PDB file of C-alpha atoms in Angstrom:
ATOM      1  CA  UNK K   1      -0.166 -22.573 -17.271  1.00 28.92           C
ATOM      2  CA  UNK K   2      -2.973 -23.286 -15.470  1.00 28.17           C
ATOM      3  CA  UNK K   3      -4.698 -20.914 -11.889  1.00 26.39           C
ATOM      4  CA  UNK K   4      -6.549 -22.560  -9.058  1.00 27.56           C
ATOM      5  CA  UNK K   5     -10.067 -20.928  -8.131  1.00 24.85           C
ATOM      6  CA  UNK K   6     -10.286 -20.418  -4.469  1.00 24.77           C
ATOM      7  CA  UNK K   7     -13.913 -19.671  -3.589  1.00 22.66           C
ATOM      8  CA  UNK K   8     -14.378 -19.184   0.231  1.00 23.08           C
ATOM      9  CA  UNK K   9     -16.571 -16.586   2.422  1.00 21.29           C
ATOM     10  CA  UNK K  10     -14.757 -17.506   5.584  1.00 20.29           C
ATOM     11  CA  UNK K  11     -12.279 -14.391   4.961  1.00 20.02           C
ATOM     12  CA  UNK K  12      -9.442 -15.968   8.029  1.00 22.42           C
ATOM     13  CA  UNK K  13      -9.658 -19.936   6.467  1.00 24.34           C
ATOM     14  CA  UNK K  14      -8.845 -18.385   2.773  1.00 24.86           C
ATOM     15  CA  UNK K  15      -5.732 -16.252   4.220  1.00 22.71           C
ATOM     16  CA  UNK K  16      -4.379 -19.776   5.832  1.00 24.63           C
ATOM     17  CA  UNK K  17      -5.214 -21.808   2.060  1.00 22.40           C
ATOM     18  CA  UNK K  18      -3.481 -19.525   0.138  1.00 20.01           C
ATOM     19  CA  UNK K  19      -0.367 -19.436   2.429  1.00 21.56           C
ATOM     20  CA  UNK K  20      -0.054 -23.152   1.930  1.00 21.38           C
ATOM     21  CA  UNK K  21      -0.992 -22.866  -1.925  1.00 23.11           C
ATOM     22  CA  UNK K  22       2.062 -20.484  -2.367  1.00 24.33           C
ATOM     23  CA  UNK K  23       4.291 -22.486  -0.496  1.00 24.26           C
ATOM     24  CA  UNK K  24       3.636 -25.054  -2.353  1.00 23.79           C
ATOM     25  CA  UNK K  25       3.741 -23.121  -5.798  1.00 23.71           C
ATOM     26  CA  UNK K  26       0.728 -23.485  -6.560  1.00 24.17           C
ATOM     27  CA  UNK K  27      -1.101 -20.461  -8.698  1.00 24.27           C
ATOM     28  CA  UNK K  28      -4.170 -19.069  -7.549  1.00 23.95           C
ATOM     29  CA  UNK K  29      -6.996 -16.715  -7.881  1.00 21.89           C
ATOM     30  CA  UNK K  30      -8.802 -15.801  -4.563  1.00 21.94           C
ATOM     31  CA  UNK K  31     -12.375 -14.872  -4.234  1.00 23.89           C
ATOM     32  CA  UNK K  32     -15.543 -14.807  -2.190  1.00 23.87           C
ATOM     33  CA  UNK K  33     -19.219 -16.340  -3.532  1.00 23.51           C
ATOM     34  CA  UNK K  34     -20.382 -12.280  -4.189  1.00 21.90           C
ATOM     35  CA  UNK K  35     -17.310 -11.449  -6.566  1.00 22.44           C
ATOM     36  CA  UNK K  36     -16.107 -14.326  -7.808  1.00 23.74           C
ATOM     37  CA  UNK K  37     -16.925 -13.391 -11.617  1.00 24.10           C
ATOM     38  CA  UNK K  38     -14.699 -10.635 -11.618  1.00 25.40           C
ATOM     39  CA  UNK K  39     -11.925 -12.049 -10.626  1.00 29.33           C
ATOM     40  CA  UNK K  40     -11.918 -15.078 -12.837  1.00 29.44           C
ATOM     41  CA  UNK K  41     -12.641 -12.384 -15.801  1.00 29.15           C
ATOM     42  CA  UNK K  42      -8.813 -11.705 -14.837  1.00 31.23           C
ATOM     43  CA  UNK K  43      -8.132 -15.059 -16.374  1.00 31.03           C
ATOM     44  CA  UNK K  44      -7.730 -15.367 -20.595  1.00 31.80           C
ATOM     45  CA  UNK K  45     -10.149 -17.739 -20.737  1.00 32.02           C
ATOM     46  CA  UNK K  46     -12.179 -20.221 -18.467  1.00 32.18           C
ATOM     47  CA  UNK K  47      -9.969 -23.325 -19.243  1.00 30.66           C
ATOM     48  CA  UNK K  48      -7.040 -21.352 -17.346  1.00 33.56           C
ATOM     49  CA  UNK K  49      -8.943 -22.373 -13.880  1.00 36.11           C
ATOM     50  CA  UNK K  50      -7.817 -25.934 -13.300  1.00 36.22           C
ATOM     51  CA  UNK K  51     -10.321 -26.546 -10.617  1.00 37.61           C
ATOM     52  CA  UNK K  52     -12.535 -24.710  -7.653  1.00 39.30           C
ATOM     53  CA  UNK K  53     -10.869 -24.635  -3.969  1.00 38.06           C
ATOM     54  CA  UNK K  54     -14.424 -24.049  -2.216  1.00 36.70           C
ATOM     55  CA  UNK K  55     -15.106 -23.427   1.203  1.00 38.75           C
ATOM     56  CA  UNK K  56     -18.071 -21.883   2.480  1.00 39.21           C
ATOM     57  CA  UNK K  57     -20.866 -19.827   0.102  1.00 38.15           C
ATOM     58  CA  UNK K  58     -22.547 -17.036   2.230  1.00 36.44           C
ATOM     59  CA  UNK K  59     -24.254 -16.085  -0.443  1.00 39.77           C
ATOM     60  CA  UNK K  60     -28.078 -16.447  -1.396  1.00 40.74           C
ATOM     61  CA  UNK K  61     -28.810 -19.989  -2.476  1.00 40.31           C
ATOM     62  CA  UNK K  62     -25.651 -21.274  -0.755  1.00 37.25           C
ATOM     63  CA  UNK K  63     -22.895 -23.867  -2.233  1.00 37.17           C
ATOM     64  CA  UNK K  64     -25.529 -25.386  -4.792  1.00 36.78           C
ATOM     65  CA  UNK K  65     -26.255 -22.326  -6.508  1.00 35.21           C
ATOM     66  CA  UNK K  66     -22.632 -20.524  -6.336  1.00 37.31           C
ATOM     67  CA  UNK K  67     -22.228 -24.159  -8.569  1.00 36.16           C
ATOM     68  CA  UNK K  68     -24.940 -24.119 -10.455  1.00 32.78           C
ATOM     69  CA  UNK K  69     -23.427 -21.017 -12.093  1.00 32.44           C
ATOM     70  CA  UNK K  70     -19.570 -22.808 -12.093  1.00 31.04           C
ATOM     71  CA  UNK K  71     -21.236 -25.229 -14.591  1.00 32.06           C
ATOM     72  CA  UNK K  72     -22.428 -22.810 -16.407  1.00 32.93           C
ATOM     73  CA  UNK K  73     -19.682 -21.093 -16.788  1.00 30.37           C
ATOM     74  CA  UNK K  74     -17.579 -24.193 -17.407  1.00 29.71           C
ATOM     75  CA  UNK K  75     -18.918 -27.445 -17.111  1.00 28.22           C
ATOM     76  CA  UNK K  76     -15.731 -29.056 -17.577  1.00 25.46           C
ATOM     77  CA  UNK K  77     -14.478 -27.302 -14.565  1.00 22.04           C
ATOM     78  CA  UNK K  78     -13.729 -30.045 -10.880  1.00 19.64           C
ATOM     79  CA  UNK K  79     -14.481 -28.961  -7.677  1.00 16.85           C
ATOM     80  CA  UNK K  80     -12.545 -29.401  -4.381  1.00 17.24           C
ATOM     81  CA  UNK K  81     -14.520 -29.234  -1.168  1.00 20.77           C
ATOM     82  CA  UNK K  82     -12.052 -28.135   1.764  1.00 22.63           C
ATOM     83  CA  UNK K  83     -13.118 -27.461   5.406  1.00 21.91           C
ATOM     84  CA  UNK K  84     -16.589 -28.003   4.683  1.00 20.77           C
ATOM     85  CA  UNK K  85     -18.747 -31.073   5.152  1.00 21.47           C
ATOM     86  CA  UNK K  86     -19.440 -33.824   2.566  1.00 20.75           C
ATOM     87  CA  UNK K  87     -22.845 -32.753   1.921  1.00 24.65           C
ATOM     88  CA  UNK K  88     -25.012 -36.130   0.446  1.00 23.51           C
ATOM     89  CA  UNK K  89     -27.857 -33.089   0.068  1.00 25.94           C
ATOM     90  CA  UNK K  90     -26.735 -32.079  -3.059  1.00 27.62           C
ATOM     91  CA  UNK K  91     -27.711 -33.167  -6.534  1.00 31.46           C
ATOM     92  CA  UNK K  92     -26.024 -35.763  -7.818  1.00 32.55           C
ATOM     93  CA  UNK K  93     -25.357 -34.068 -10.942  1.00 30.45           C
ATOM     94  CA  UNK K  94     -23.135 -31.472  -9.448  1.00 25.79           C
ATOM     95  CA  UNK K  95     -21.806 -33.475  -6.713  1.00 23.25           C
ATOM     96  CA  UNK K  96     -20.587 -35.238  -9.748  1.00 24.86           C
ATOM     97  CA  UNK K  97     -17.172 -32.151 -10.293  1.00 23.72           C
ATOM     98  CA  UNK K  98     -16.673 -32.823  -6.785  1.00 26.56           C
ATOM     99  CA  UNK K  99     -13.438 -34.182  -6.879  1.00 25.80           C
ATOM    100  CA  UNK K 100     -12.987 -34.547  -3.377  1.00 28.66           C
ATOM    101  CA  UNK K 101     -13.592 -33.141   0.271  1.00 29.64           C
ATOM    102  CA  UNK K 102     -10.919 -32.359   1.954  1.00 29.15           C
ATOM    103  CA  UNK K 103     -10.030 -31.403   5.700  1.00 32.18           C
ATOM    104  CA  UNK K 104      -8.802 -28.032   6.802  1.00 33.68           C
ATOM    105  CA  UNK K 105      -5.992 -28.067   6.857  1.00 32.99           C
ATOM    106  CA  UNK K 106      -5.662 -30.702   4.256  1.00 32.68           C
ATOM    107  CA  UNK K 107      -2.907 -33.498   4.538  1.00 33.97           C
ATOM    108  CA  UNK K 108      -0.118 -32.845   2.290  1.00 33.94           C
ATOM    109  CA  UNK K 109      -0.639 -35.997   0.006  1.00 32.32           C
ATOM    110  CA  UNK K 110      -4.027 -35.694   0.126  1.00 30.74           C
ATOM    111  CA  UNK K 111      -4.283 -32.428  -1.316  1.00 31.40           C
ATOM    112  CA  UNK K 112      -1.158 -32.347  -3.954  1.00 29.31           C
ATOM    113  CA  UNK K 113      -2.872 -36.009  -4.997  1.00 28.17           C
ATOM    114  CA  UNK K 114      -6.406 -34.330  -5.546  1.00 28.30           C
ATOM    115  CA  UNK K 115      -4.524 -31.356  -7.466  1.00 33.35           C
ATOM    116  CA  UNK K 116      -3.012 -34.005  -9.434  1.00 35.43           C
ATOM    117  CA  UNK K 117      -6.647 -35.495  -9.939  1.00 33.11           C
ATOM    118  CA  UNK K 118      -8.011 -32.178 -10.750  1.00 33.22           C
ATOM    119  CA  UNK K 119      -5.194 -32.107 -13.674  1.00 35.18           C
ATOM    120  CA  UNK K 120      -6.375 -35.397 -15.415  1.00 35.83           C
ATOM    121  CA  UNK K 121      -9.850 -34.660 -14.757  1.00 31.71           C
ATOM    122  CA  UNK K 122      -9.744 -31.455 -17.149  1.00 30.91           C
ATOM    123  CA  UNK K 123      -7.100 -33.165 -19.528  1.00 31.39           C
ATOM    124  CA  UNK K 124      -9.969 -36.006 -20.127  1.00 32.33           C
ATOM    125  CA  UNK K 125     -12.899 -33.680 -20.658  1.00 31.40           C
ATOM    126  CA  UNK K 126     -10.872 -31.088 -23.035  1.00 32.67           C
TER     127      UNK K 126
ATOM    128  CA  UNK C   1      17.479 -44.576  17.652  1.00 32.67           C
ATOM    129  CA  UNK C   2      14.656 -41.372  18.072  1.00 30.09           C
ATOM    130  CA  UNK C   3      12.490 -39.601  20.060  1.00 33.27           C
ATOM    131  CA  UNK C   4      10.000 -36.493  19.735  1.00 36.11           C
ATOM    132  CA  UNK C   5      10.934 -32.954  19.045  1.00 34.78           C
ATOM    133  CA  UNK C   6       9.533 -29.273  18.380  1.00 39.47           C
ATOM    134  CA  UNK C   7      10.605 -26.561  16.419  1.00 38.92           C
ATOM    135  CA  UNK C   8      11.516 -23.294  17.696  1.00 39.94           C
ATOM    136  CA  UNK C   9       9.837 -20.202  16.041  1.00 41.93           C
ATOM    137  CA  UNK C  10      11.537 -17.065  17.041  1.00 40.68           C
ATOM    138  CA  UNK C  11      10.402 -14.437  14.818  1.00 42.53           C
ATOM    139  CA  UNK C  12       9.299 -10.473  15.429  1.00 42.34           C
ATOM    140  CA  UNK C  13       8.197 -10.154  11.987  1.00 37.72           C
ATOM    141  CA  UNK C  14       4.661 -11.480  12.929  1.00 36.61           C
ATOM    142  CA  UNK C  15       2.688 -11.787   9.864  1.00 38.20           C
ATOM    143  CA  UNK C  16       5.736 -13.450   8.742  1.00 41.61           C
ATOM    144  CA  UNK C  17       5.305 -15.845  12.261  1.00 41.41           C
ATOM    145  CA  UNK C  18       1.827 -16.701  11.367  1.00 41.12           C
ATOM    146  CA  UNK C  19       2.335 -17.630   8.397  1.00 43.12           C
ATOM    147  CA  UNK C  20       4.940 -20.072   8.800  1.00 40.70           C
ATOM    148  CA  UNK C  21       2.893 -21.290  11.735  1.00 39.67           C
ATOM    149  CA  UNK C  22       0.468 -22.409   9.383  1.00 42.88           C
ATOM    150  CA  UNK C  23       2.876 -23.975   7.003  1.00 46.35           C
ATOM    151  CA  UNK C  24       4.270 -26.022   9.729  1.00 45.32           C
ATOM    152  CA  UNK C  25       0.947 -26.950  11.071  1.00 41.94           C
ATOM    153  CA  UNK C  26       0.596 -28.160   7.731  1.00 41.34           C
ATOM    154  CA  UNK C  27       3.533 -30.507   7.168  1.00 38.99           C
ATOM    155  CA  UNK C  28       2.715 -31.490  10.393  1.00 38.99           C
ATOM    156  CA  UNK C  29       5.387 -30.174  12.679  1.00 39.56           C
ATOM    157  CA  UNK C  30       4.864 -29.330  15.918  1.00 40.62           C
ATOM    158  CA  UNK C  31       6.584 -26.154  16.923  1.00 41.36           C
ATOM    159  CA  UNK C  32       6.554 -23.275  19.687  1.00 40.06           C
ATOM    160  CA  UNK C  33       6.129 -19.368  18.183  1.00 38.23           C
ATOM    161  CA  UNK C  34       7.556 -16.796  19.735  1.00 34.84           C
ATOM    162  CA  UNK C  35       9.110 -12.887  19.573  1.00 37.55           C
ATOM    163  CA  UNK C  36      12.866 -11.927  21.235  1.00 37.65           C
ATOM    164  CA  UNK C  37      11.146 -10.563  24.084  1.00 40.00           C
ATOM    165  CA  UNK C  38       9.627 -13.588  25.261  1.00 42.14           C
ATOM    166  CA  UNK C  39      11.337 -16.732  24.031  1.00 39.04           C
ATOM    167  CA  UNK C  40      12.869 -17.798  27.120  1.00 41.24           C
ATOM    168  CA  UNK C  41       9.506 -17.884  28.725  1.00 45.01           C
ATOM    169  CA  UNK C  42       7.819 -19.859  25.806  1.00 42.91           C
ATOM    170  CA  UNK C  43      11.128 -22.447  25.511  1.00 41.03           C
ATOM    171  CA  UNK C  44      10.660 -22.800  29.217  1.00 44.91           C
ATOM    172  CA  UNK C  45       7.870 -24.808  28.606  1.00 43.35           C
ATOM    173  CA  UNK C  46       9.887 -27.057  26.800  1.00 43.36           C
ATOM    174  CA  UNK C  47      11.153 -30.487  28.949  1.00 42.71           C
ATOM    175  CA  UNK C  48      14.719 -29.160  28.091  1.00 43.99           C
ATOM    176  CA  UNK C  49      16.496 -27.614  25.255  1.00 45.18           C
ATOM    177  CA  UNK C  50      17.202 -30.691  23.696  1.00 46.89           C
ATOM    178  CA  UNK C  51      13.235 -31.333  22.708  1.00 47.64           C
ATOM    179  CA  UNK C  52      13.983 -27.937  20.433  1.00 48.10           C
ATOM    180  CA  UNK C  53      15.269 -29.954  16.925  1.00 46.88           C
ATOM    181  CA  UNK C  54      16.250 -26.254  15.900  1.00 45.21           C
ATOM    182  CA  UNK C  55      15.642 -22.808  15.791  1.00 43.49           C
ATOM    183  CA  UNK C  56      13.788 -20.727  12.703  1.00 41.79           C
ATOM    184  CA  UNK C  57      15.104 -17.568  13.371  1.00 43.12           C
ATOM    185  CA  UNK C  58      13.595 -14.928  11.692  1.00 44.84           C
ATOM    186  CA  UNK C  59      13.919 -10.531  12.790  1.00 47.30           C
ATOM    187  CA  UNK C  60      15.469  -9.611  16.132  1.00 46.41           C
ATOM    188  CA  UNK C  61      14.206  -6.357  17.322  1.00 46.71           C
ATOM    189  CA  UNK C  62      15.396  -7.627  20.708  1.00 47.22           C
ATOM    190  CA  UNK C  63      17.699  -5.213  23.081  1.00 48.20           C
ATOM    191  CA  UNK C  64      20.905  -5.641  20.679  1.00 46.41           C
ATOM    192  CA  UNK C  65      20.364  -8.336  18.057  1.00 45.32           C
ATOM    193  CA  UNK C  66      19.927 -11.484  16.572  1.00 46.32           C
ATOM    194  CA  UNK C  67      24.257 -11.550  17.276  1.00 45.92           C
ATOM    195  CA  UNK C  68      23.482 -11.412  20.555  1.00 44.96           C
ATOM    196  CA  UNK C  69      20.307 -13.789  20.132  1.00 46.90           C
ATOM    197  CA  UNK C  70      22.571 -16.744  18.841  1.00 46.02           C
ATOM    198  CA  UNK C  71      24.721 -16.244  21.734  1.00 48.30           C
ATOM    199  CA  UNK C  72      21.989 -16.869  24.350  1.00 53.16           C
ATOM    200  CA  UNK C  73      20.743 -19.375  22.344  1.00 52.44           C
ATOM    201  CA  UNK C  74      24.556 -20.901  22.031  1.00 53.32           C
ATOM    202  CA  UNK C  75      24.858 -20.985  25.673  1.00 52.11           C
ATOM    203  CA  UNK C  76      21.541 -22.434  26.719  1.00 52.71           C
ATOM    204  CA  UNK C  77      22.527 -25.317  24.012  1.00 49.23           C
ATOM    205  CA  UNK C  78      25.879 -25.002  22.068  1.00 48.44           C
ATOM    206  CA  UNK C  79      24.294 -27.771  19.818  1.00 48.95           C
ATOM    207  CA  UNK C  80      20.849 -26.219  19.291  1.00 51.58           C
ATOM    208  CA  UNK C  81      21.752 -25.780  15.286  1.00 47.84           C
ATOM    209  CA  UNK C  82      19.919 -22.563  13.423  1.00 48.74           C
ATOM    210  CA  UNK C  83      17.937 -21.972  10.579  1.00 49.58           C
ATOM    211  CA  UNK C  84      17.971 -18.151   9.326  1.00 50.74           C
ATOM    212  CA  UNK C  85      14.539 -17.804   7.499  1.00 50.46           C
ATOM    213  CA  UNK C  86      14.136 -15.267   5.523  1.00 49.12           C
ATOM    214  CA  UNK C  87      17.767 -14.035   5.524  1.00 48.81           C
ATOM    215  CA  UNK C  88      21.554 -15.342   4.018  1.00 45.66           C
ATOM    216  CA  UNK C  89      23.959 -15.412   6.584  1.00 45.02           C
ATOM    217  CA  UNK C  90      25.634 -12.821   7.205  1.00 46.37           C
ATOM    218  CA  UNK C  91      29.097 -12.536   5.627  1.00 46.57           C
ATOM    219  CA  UNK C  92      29.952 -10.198   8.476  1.00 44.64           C
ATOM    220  CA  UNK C  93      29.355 -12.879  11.797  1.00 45.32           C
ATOM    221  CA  UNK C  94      31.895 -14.583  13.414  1.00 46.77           C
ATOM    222  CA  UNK C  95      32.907 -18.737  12.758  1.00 45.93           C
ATOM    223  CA  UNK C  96      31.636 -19.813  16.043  1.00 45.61           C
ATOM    224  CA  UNK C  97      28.204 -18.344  15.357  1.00 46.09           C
ATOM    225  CA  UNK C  98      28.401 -19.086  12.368  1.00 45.05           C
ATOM    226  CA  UNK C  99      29.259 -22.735  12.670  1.00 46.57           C
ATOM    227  CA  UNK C 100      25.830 -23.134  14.321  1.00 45.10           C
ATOM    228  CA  UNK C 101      23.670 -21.452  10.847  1.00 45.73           C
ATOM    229  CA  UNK C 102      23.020 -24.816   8.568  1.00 46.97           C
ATOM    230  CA  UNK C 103      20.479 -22.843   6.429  1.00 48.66           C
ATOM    231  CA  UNK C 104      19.362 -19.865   5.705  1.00 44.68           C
ATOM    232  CA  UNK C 105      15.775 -20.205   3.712  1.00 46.30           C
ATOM    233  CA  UNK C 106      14.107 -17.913   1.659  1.00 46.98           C
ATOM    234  CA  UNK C 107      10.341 -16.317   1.732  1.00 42.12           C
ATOM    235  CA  UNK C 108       8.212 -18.114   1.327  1.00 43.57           C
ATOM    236  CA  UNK C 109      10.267 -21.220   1.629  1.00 45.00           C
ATOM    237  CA  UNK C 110      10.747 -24.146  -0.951  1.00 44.89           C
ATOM    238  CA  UNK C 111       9.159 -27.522   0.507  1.00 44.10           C
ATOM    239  CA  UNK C 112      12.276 -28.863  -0.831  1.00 44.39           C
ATOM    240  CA  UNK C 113      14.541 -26.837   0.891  1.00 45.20           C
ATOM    241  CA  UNK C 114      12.503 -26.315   4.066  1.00 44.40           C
ATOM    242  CA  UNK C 115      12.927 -30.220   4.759  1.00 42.86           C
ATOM    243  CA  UNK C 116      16.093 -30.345   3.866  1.00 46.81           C
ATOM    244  CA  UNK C 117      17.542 -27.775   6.615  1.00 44.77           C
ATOM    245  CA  UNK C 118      15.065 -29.732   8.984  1.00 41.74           C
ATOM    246  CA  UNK C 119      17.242 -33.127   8.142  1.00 43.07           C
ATOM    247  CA  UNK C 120      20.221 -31.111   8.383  1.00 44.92           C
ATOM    248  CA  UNK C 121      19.253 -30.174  11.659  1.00 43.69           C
ATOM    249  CA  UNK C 122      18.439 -33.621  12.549  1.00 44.44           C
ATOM    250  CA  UNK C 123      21.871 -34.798  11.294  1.00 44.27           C
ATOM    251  CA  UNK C 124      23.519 -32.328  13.440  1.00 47.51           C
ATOM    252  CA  UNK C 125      21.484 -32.795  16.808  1.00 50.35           C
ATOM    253  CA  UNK C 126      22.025 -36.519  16.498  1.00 50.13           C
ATOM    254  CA  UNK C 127      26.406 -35.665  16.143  1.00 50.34           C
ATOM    255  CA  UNK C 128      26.190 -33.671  19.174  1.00 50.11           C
ATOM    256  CA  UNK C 129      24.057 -35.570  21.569  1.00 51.29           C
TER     257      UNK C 129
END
């Protein structure tokens, strides 16, 4: 009975993502980079987020950092990238839970087929 | 055995209208958006009727009501089938009407159920033409 994370500062992109996300059943938790902490202390326990919907990080430090902390939190915890480019800066080591990085809007397949990847992904690591 | 068609979006309940906007942009439908006070001017812009696979139909705060809606829309095309999102069909309209309503979907829709009233549609279009 797992939640999706949906971390994304672009306030009008998030509204659209969690439209689809309901119509397609799909459970989720929706936050910004600033409060994100507080809303996933709504959840039991960590292991109830199946994975990270990220967009954009406004926040002080940017995507890296807001996933720095993720990792810390839960380093067993996948990331999906959507609307947002494939960014070869990062560190390797945390471009690592990055699943994939998907378009906005993403395709259909695409996206139910990384959710489905994002399932596994946790399953192995438990 | 095809060609290309739009959906019709007729819907006053506007956060409602947006939303299924983006849903449909999402599967990938093409479709027109409109209110009861303008959807002759936006269906206009269609070729003819017949590029309109169907009509979602959702509040009618138009002069009358959505009654009086599906009879415009009856008489522009009398094989135009309609989709009633949001709402069961009312128990209370008459069999012509009626006759025209393959669906009636609820908020917000199942994927399941949302294509199947589109290949209804399709089915029914494709009798008629």
């Amino acid at each position: 009975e797992t939640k999706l994370l949906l971390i994304d500062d672009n306030l009008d992109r998030s509204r659209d993502l969690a439209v689809i996300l309901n119509f397609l059943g799909e459970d989720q938790l929706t936050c910004n980079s600033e409060d994100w902490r507080e809303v996933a202390a709504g959840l039991s326990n960590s292991r109830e987020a199946l994975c990270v919907l990220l967009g954009s990080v406004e926040s002080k430090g940017g995507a890296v950092e807001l996933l720095k902390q993720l990792a810390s939190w839960d380093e067993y915890l996948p990331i999906l990238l959507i609307g947002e480019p494939a960014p070869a800066d990062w560190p390797e080591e945390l471009r690592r839970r990055v699943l994939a990085s998907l378009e906005m809007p993403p395709s259909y397949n695409k996206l139910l087929d990384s959710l489905h990847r994002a399932q596994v992904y946790r399953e192995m690591y438990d």
